[PDB]
């Protein structure tokens, strides 16, 4: 339970929009992860940001996603641009909350985003 997320806009390929994991308060973390899954394929990774400053991206998403962390509103924002129809999926925010030394990410919450010309 604890945290939560929803929202998102359906846009045409080549657009730009800001996915936001809507904040649920101040939570202890060291790694925020944007992650995407579409039916018919293995659930794949998008990008991780680190409280220290480390930033990792998947190989297929270069130059199209920008990840940023806002510690006042404690939310991670993904600005997505130059879209192609392979991003049609639902996007999840996985946490890092230390459980025994890390684990139990709260990626239950999802945001369905489909990019299409029609």
């Amino acid at each position: 339970v604890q945290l939560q997320e929803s929202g998102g806009g359906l846009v045409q390929p080549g657009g730009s929009l800001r996915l936001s994991c809507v904040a649920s308060g101040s939570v202890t973390f060291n790694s925020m992860g944007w992650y995407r899954q579409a039916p018919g394929k293995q659930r794949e990774l998008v990008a991780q940001i680190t409280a220290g400053g480390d930033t990792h991206y998947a190989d297929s998403v270069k130059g199209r996603f920008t990840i940023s962390e806002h510690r006042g509103k404690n939310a991670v924002y993904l600005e997505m641009h130059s879209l192609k129809p392979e991003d049609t999926a639902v996007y999840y925010c996985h946490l890092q909350v230390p459980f025994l030394g890390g684990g139990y990410d709260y990626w239950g919450q999802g945001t369905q985003v489909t990019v299409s010309s029609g």
Binding site: V1, V97, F99, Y104
Partner: protein, 49 residues
């Protein structure tokens, strides 16, 4: 430098509820065996005693 419970106060935050619905009466702790059971070492094969 504290082997026992350190003196102080700290509130406990509720991490997760699990929908089990069965009786629970006995529990056990699982540890990491650093040494080898077949060929135990003389000493230090565990973790810092």
């Amino acid at each position: 430098l504290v082997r026992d419970l350190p003196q102080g106060f700290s509130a406990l935050e509720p991490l997760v509820d699990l929908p089990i619905g069965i009786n629970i009466t006995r529990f056990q702790t699982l540890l990491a065996l650093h040494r080898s059971y077949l060929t135990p070492g003389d000493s230090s094969s565990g973790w810092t005693a």
